[PDB]
Design a protein around this nucleic acid. Structure first.
Ligand code: 6EK
Ligand code: MG
Ligand code: MG
Ligand code: MG
Ligand code: MG
Ligand code: MG
Ligand code: MG
Ligand code: MG
Ligand code: MG
Ligand code: MG
Ligand code: MG
Ligand code: MG
Ligand code: MG
Ligand code: MG
Ligand code: MG
Ligand code: MG
Ligand code: MG
Ligand code: MG
Ligand code: MG
Ligand code: MG
Ligand code: MG
Ligand code: MG
Ligand code: MG
Ligand code: MG
Ligand code: MG
Ligand code: MG
Ligand code: MG
Ligand code: MG
Ligand code: MG
Ligand code: MG
Ligand code: MG
Ligand code: MG
Ligand code: MG
Ligand code: MG
Ligand code: MG
Ligand code: ZN
Lengths: 24, 60, 99, 127, 206, 83, 125, 155
RNA sequence: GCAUGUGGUUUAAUUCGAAGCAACGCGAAGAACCUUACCAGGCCUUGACAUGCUAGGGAACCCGGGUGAAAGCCUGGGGUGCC
RNA sequence: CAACCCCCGCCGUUAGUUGCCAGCGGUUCGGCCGGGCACUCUAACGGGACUGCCCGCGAAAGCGGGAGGAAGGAGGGGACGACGUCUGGUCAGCAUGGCCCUUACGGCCUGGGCGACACACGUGCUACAAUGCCCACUACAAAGCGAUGCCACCCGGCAACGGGGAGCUAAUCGCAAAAAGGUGGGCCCAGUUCGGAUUGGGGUCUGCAACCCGACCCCAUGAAGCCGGAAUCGCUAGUAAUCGCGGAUCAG
């Protein structure tokens, strides 16, 4: 789901953080 | 590396952001290494000459 | 009390210089933690070989800054008065911090 | 009182400390079976003992760092065998058959330029 | 697209660098360009003296430029004058305390960069190119050398058809790492165009 | 979009010409090159010829076209179809 | 369970179920099941008749939804074309709008591929 | 392999039964080096087998291979007109290898939702003599003596 | 389906090279302006850079106004060092 | 060709910090403190492998097989490209013969273009799902990079991020969460809790300036796609497949 920017995998791959993959 | 653009390169420009590097040698715009201020051609050349200090050829 | 870092490109000269400092501190009255080999920071460069096209051949260059620590505990005066009289390799940088 | 053996495998380094007794084993401050929670391969790490029949006649204080847990497994597994011999030099005879003293030379291959992967060449397709 | 620069290959094993100093990422960029401005000038101003190497050792605000030259007087100058002029013009373009010393290349027949040059001149002065080479290689082996090789490439003679001449004696083992092999390159600039001279000199197994 | 801290961006020298045209109640054609300028409600009802790389084309500014930048109304490239 | 106009499907957990309405995606749904205090995990056919009503209240009233939302998006593009702005033309000609390449791809915007003639390259045939 | 004959890889014995065949099968199950998941899909499938039959899964396994091992097959030869489909007997290893592959490949075909089951069932069915694991053995063996008219162009 | 390169076509311009393997995520290890070589428009002419030469006016240099999209164009004042 | 050089695999000597924790003293349970360099490691010099030993075949070279050994017959990988071929590539890196322009083919700027789109190919990414997807909790790397920068920790904020602010010229401080894996729970074969294109809306950051043409965050939209025709590519072991991590260029 690496294209899905609403997953941990999604942000993991885009190299970003958001709601769906936050820092700490 | 037309002459004017090597000079323009040095001209402190109207905005901080038109800052761009060229090769201190050939003037090449494109593959310029911060650290040497040289392009990947010149790097290669001077490296072999032995004129970049401590720059060995890698191998691992 | 006196701590010497040794950072240079060539590890022969770097290592040599540090022997000239382990002995300097002996013949002056002190004990020493030997020349400690700190890890070495490599800067690689990966240039396309040809000038035009041909991306599928490169050449790999590197830049190896080598690091040696040396400590002289129990630092006397006959020590310092044998250190600001040395200097023998060129491509070696010294930095001394009394910590 | 202890017997050591230093087992490494492919960017992993295992520190094996053997002390006779029950059979229990610590890696990095956890029970062996809790550290390798659901890893099948894990059991293999204690094959060096089982093949000399000293499982239970020992304990183990072990630490690993580096590699993946499996890499750590074959490193422990080495390290134990390395240790059974500092204890009993005659054990070599029993272990070398199945070659439990052998450092697996195999390791990840340098990515090479103009490949995608060290071997995986880029695709040539059509004309 | 063939052979590796015989120096950069041997570099660090059987051959040394022409600049020897340390510098962090901050300073390196410019001490480099500073060296290149030095070696830019001394190269122009000393072609008359036949110059092989320009060594640049460095401290802090200190530069030890060792210039390696065939005819060491020409560098010095009558009275001792010419050298002073350089040292000042150096410490001008550098803005540091330039320490220019001079070293007598005792035998130009075993200095590749010189052999190269001597040929290029000869080629510029319109000399016979084939002879020019055999006779250069000659002189090199005559003086100790264990192997030598010269390659002139370009519009040889007048020549619409740009070809390549070459010649060698002894062993010139470009693959053998422990082989001390001096390389030099000269560029001849001519009415018909430009030609390149490479000269390899095999000097000794280490 | 442009960060909200720094407001919107209009080139001072286009904003200039309009304020003079407003604070005098005059409706005379303007030409500029700064496509990159936002559209404050001050511009409304005016007519601005803007550069599209070749010429200045008139752009009558109505109400609903305020959030945008001028360049949106002079396309830069010419397209017909493929033949 | 008739909410917002559409019968959301029973058998499927409520946290999912609501997605099938226009203006409800994953988040808006799970926000609605908090604000009305309902275990989302329970199936739709396992609801209080009045539990359902609470859900209908919130959902139908706060957010602009269904075909009523299709309205605003539609008349939003409509605005853009009527304005005569770039994004307008791109919408009109059925091209990409947020600035993609068109020399290849760009297919979802132009539908299936209307192949045409072409020439003989590079040497002869 | 042009200079030498390639030397078969020696596998590590299974971590529960010891049979190297177990492992060989496992590897063929796994993908993307996911060996742990594989073992689990194997050994859990044994549990279902040990459950729904009572006997020992190791042996239902070691039986389901004989019943997919093809005693001979068709290979390919081209003579002087075109390509006559030639028959030829199948080695020790090639049998064992074809079997494991086919077991898995057609186990993965079955309708069952979960992997461990799909293995368990095919590993059972075939162990008896039914299911498209054997029907792709009874297929390669079919053409073995259906084109035996061309069985004189041998190698 | 999307990312890039390319053929083509289109364009005021879509800068240029690469063209079977050995061109096509290749020169580009970083195209919004810059880069930038193309196009349109407004500008400069010993010139953005080198070494000079003949004739006159000037210390060098520093700050402000006008016009302008900017570039440029016109203009005001401070300043008199060294041999 | 091989060899001399580099990296990896075993052991040695020298070396004990910013690394290390084996027995011991003290513990706020953090190797934290004492103390110690054993071990790990770091990184500079060295040893070790020769068909040397045994059996079988061979005039010989060498081949097959075994023993000891970390390693066995080039141990794995690197750097290293012969005389020449291609009138190969590049005058747009640089250099250079010759021809051409010189109030123009030179130079400055602002705007536009290199990003155009009936179409075609090349290389790749993400998928079409249950050996999967989502959410939570829980482990194990290496290599690099950073004092104009990396930014720990507190605060606001769904979040991008912003405000405050400690350490670090760095084996100390940081980037740094490694992801696959493990444990728990959800979904139950569905164009779906598969896929995440496209578009609407609202923000963030960089930058003089994000219309043409940036990335990022959040809400809503949730296209094609259910494993790919004729053809065709890669890889022979830590390889393929798979999973994350760093760097160069760089305001972005
Ligand atoms: N590098 C190399 O050797 O070629 C490799 C491959 O590309 C061939 C290439 N093939 C294709 O297009 C096919 N492939 C699929 C797409 C379409 C087409 O069907 C091709 O173009 N063939 C014909 C075409 C053609 C028909 N008519 C004219 N005038 N040309 C040709 O041009 N032949 C030349 C000749 O007749 O001399 C050529 O110089 C040649 C000399 N010796 C040989 Cl063998 N070939
Ligand atoms: Mg999803
Ligand atoms: Mg030029
Ligand atoms: Mg820039
Ligand atoms: Mg190559
Ligand atoms: Mg890998
Ligand atoms: Mg490696
Ligand atoms: Mg490539
Ligand atoms: Mg990849
Ligand atoms: Mg050649
Ligand atoms: Mg040549
Ligand atoms: Mg103005
Ligand atoms: Mg044969
Ligand atoms: Mg082109
Ligand atoms: Mg050209
Ligand atoms: Mg790019
Ligand atoms: Mg531009
Ligand atoms: Mg411009
Ligand atoms: Mg204690
Ligand atoms: Mg201490
Ligand atoms: Mg060594
Ligand atoms: Mg023999
Ligand atoms: Mg060799
Ligand atoms: Mg040609
Ligand atoms: Mg392009
Ligand atoms: Mg297609
Ligand atoms: Mg918060
Ligand atoms: Mg922050
Ligand atoms: Mg995880
Ligand atoms: Mg589960
Ligand atoms: Mg469909
Ligand atoms: Mg389906
Ligand atoms: Mg091979
Ligand atoms: Mg990456
Ligand atoms: Mg970076
Ligand atoms: Zn350059």
């Amino acid at each position: 789901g690496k294209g899905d920017r609403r997953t941990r995998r999604g942000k993991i791959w885009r190299g970003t953080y958001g709601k769906y993959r936050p820092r700490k | 590396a037309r002459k004017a653009l090597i000079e323009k390169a040095k001209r402190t420009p109207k905005f901080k952001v038109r800052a761009y590097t060229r090769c201190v040698r050939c003037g090449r715009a494109r593959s310029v290494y911060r650290f040497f201020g040289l392009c990947r051609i010149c790097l290669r050349e001077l490296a072999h000459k032995g004129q970049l200090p401590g720059v060995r050829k890698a191998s691992w | 009390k006196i701590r010497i870092k040794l950072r240079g490109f060539d590890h022969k000269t770097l290592d040599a210089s540090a022997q000239k400092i382990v002995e300097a501190a002996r013949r002056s009255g002190a004990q020493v933690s030997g020349p400690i080999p700190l890890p070495t920071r490599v800067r690689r460069f990966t240039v396309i070989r040809g000038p035009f096209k041909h991306k599928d051949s490169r050449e790999h260059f590197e830049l190896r800054t080598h690091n040696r620590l040396v400590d002289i505990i129990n630092p006397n005066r006959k020590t310092i008065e044998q250190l600001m009289t040395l200097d023998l390799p060129t491509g070696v940088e010294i930095e001394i911090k009394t910590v | 009182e202890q017997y050591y053996g230093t087992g490494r495998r492919k960017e992993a380094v295992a520190r094996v400390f053997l002390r006779p007794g029950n059979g229990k084993v610590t890696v990095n401050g956890q029970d062996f079976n809790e550290y390798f929670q659901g890893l099948v391969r894990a059991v293999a790490a204690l094959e060096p003992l089982r093949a000399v029949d000293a499982l239970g006649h020992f304990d183990a204080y072990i630490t690993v760092r580096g590699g993946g847990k499996s890499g750590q497994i074959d490193a422990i597994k080495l390290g134990i065998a390395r240790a059974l011999v500092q204890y009993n030099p005659d054990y070599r005879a029993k272990l070398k058959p199945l070659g439990f003293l052998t450092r697996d030379a195999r390791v990840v291959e340098r990515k090479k330029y103009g490949k995608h992967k060290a071997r995986r060449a880029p695709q040539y397709s059509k004309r | 697209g063939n052979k590796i620069h015989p120096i950069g290959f041997r570099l660090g094993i059987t051959r040394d660098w022409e600049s020897r100093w340390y510098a962090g990422k901050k300073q390196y960029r410019h001490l480099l360009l500073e060296d290149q401005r030095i070696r830019g000038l001394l190269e122009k101003e000393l072609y008359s003296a036949g110059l092989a190497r320009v060594d640049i050792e460095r401290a802090a605000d200190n530069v030890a430029v060792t210039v390696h030259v065939a005819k060491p007087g020409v560098v010095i100058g009558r009275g001792g004058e010419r050298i002073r002029v350089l040292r000042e013009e150096l410490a001008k373009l550098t803005g540091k305390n330039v320490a220019l010393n001079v070293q007598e290349v005792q035998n130009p027949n075993l200095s590749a960069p010189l052999v190269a040059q001597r040929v290029a001149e000869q080629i510029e002065r319109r000399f016979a190119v084939r002879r020019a080479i055999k006779q250069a290689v000659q002189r090199v082996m005559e003086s100790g050398a264990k192997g030598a090789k010269v390659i002139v490439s370009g519009r040889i003679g007048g020549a619409e058809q740009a070809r390549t001449e070459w010649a060698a004696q002894g062993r010139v083992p470009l693959h053998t790492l422990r082989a001390n092999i001096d390389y030099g390159f000269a560029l001849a600039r001519t009415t018909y165009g430009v030609l390149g001279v490479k000269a390899y000199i095999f000097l000794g197994e280490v | 979009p442009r960060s909200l801290k720094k407001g919107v961006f209009v080139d001072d020298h286009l904003l200039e010409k309009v304020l003079e045209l407003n604070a005098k109640g005059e409706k005379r054609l303007i030409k500029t090159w700064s496509r990159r300028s936002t559209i404050v409600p001050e511009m409304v009802g005016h007519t601005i010829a803007v550069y599209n790389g070749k010429q200045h084309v008139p752009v009558y500014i109505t109400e609903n076209m305020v959030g945008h930048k001028l360049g949106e109304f002079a396309p830069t490239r010419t397209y017909r179809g493929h033949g | 369970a008739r909410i917002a106009g559409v019968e959301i499907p029973r058998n499927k957990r409520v946290d999912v179920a609501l997605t099938y309405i226009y203006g409800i995606g994953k988040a808006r749904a799970k926000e609605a099941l908090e604000k009305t205090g309902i275990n989302p995990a329970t199936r739709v056919k396992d609801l209080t008749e009045a539990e359902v009503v609470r859900l209908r209240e919130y959902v139908e009233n706060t957010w602009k939804l269904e075909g009523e939302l299709r309205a605003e998006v539609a008349a939003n593009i409509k605005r853009l074309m009527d304005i005569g702005c770039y994004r307008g033309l791109r919408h009109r000609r059925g091209l990409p709008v947020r600035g993609q390449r068109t020399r290849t791809n760009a297919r979802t915007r132009k539908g299936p591929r209307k192949t045409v003639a072409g020439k003989k390259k590079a040497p002869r045939k | 392999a042009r200079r030498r004959r390639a030397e078969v890889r020696q596998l590590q014995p299974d971590l529960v039964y010891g049979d190297v065949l177990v492992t060989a099968f496992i590897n063929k199950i796994m993908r993307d080096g996911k060996k742990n998941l594989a073992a689990r899909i194997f050994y859990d499938a044994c549990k279902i087998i040990q459950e729904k039959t009572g006997q020992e899964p190791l042996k239902v396994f070691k039986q389901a291979v004989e019943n997919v091992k093809p005693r001979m097959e068709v290979r390919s030869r081209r003579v002087g007109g075109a390509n006559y489909q030639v028959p030829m007997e199948v080695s020790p290893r090639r049998q064992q290898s074809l079997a494991l592959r086919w077991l898995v490949q057609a186990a993965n075909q079955r309708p069952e939702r979960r992997a461990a089951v799909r293995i368990a069932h095919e590993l059972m069915d075939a162990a008896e003599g039914k299911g498209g694991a054997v029907k792709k053995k009874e297929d390669v063996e079919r053409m073995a003596e259906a084109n035996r008219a061309y069985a004189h162009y041998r190698w």
